[PDB]
């Protein structure tokens, strides 16, 4: 996979697209329906701290995790059991992560997630992003796009 560096990933981001084998885990309510506040690392990006947001009922429920980087350049963190998370595509403004949740139950859900530094893909991001859950074996109709329902950053 792909290291990411201090520099790339310091700041704020917000989730444009989730998209997940178990739907449940990412479509309103869902565990997984992580919207993206703010990254920050340090030293060789060991340390990741994710800031984001779920909603429950109207309102925002704010959450931080601290990814571990291991050597295979996978993070691991508990939030809704345990995560495996890595790097697959990264541009300035826009990175997929890919990540395994086990949760409590031992259900094994594998997610896409996209986050921006922009509110939209283009058409060729979007056509990327569909052969990758292809790729990993995740329905494209489960795909949730969170930008017309982010409202904890503004």
Known sequence: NLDISP????????????????????????????????????????????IFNVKLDSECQTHTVVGQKHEDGRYTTDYSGRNYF??????????????????????ETNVILVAGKREDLNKAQKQELRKLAEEYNIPNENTQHLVPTDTCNQ
């Open 7 to 50: 520099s790339e990933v310091n700041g704020d981001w917000r989730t444009l697209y989730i998209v997940a084998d178990n739907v449940e885990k990412v479509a309103e309510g869902g565990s997984l329906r992580a919207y993206f506040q703010h990254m920050e690392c340090g030293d060789e990006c060991q340390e990741l701290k994710i």
């Open 86 to 107: 890595h790097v697959l595509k990264k541009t300035d403004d826009i990175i997929f992560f890919h990540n395994v949740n086990v949760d409590e139950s031992g259900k």
